[PDB]
Design a protein around this nucleic acid. Structure first.
Lengths: 64, 63
DNA sequence: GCGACGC
DNA sequence: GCGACGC
DNA sequence: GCGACGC
DNA sequence: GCGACGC
């Protein structure tokens, strides 16, 4: 599963398996990911978020 | 529990796990914290402080 | 003023 | 030693 | 504001 | 070391 979002006008795509941290900011889902070793930031609206990312977020909010 | 504060125009947030000294100034809670490598300073009105910070304050004052 | 980093 | 958080 | 790597 | 995702 890949998340597609544009960040800084450029469109990006990220495999959910590389997502490291996930959190909610209003109506969007914010996250960090492992981009070939280095860590990047990405975000996507909650409505456009793959279900797998939403599961990740729910899991993150429950453990704290 | 994180502490939200505004410092030098910037809204910031810090975990209480990283807050060190805490003291009261009139009606606000002042504190220092680990800002990886250096100690930062933050402050929030008591009315807006989370319980955990106020608890740390009570502890500091009782010492 | 109240309490307590970076110059 | 002195300037730079909420009220 | 909201939460938490790119200049 | 400070600050630049949707509404």
């Amino acid at each position: 599963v890949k998340v597609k979002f544009k960040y800084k006008g450029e469109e990006k795509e990220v495999d959910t398996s590389k997502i490291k941290k996930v959190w909610r900011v209003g109506k969007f889902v914010s996250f960090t990911y492992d981009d070939n070793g280095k860590t990047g930031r990405g975000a996507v609206s909650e409505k456009d978020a793959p279900k797998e990312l939403l599961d990740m977020l729910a899991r993150a909010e429950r453990e704290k």
